Design goal:
heterodimer; A: mainly alpha; Non-ribosomal Peptide Synthetase Peptidyl Carrier Protein, Chain A; 4 helices; 0% strand; globular; B: alpha+beta; five-stranded mixed beta sheet; 23% strand; binds 4'-phosphopantetheine; TqaA (chain B); biosynthetic protein; Biochemistry; enzyme
Chain lengths: 75, 436
């Protein structure tokens, strides 16, 4: 499933760095925890989010574990 | 705005006094002065002190560059040039600048093992005479060499008030980059973390969402004490398979809650757990060096009629009881108890669970050099019991650490076994009902 918004793209790049998985393998329907993330990865993702101008916290990643859903609630 | 959190009127006079008693170097300056956090203090009171040891072998090793790297590392991270002291019974931190780092150096006899020399210094004087609250800098370097300088041990000593699991790897990767002359991004320091916490607090404490959250979260709760030389007890199990949507940490905490439920006679349990303290919107919060850890209450409430609760129900509940607190986990525990409960502010946590989902192995890729890691460690609990869980590739290791007067060997062994057994049972059958 293809990345469709700018937020989805920026978020995928963040997941790629934090999970050390290649960007090409990330689809919009991917689940952060199923791809191997845990609470500490989520903390790092959230911080990298801020540096890219997105805004979400660790709780948002637990509530919206799927990439496309997380990209909507980021501000 | 440096010194804006100082609890002392003339911070510069304190520094001058310490210089004149030869506790800190006379050519240092005072860059800042702040209160020490409760978590920093937990570690300092328990003598928590480490020596991170790097055995380096090869012909290309450059001793001058090692020395200079120690100096540069301290210039970069202000927690590493922080001194701790008490004022009116309360611990503060002095952040020094213009600090010259002096490496303790040993040139061994032929045939002498450098590591045995480090061990001898460690046990003979380095930890037995440790007095962090006397104000002497806890961060110090030692370099022990065989003749020829092709086999060297480098040592960094440090108080646990100065690092945590998220950030310690950055100390080693920064060291390597500076040695290798690789470029480094700018970073923040621990002081910036303390200023950021205070700026997000509200001046009226009854209007702070955080203390409102804790008040509701802990309403009607009671914190029981499950248990009345320092001992470590270990127990390995096969790595658990994780039910969909559940983290390993949740599994460990649910197991602990079930255990306590039975051990006490209670459906409503509160115990402590370790959180990373880095879920805050501040620049470089993921990488800054310091101890941002916090030990906070976790509450798990079984229904009065749990007949139908499954393991999954317990897992989802336990996980939600952690995530509800994510935005509020960063405040001092004594402030939680003072502003959000009837409990005495200095009420201690008696059981603390730490899940170690951080780096467990370390590297120092110096440029051909063979570099091995090892460490020495002191940690002595007071009346509390600690349960650590380490997730390795081949096993999940459950570790119990407590004083023997609180938990004797047989009791500790049984605790480790029970928590392990419950974790495995949860893993192999998550759809089961709690009447196992
Ligand atoms: P998540 O559900 O995967 O993790 C929860 C945690 C609360 C276990 C994790 O977020 C965490 O804060 N800390 C564990 C790391 C830690 O601080 N280790 C000890 C430092 S020396």
């Amino acid at each position: 499933k293809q990345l469709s918004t700018d937020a989805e793209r920026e978020l995928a790049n963040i997941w790629a760095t934090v999970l050390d998985i290649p960007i090409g393998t990330i689809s919009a329907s991917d689940n952060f925890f199923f791809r191997g993330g845990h609470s500490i990865d989520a903390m790092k993702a959230s911080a990298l989010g801020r540096a890219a101008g997105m805004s979400f916290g660790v709780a948002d990643i637990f509530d919206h574990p799927v990439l496309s859903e997380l990209a909507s609630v980021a501000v | 705005e440096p010194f804006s959190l100082s609890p002392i009127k003339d911070p510069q006079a304190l520094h001058k006094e310490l210089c004149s008693k030869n506790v800190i170097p006379v050519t240092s300056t005072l860059e800042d002065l702040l209160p020490a956090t409760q978590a920093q203090h937990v570690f300092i009171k328990r003598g928590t002190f480490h020596s991170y040891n790097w055995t380096i072998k090869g012909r290309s090793l450059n001793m001058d560059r090692l020395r200079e790297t120690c100096q540069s590392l301290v210039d970069r991270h202000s927690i590493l040039r922080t001194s701790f002291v008490e004022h009116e019974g309360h611990p503060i931190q002095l952040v020094l600048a213009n600090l010259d780092v002096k490496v303790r150096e040993v040139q061994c006899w032929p045939g002498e093992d450098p590591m045995e020399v480090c061990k001898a210094l460690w046990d003979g004087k380095d930890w037995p005479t440790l007095n962090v609250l006397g104000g002497s800098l806890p961060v110090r370097f030692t370099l022990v060499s065989c003749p020829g300088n092709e086999h060297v041990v480098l040592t960094i000593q440090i108080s646990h008030s100065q690092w945590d699991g998220v950030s310690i790897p950055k100390l080693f990767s920064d060291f390597a980059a500076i040695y290798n002359q690789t470029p480094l991004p700018p970073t923040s320091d621990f002081a910036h973390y303390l200023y950021h916490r205070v700026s997000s607090a509200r001046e009226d404490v009854q209007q702070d969402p955080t203390f409102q959250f804790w008040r509701h979260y802990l309403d009607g709760a009671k914190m029981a004490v499950p248990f009345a030389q320092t001992l470590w007890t270990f127990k390995g199990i096969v790595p658990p398979t994780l039910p969909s949507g559940i983290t390993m940490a949740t599994l460990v905490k649910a197991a602990t809650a079930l255990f306590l439920s039975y051990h006490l006679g209670s459906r409503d349990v509160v115990f402590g757990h370790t959180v990373n303290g880095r879920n805050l919107p501040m620049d470089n919060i993921e990488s800054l060096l310091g101890c941002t850890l916090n030990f906070v209450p976790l509450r798990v409430t079984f229904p009065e009629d749990s007949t139908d609760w499954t393991v999954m129900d317990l897992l989802h509940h336990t996980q939600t009881q952690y995530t509800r607190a994510l935005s509020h986990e960063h405040v001092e525990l004594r402030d939680i108890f003072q502003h959000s409960t009837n409990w005495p502010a200095e009420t201690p946590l008696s059981l603390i669970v730490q899940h170690q989902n951080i780096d467990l192995s370390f590297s120092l890729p110096l440029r051909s050099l063979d570099v091995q890691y090892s460490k020495f460690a002191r940690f002595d609990p007071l009346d509390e019991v600690w349960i650590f869980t380490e997730p390795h590739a081949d096993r999940l290791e459950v570790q119990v650490c407590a004083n023997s007067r609180v938990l004797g060997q047989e009791q500790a062994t049984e605790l480790a076994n029970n928590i392990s057994a419950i974790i495995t049972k949860f893993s192999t059958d998550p759809t089961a009902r709690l009447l196992d």
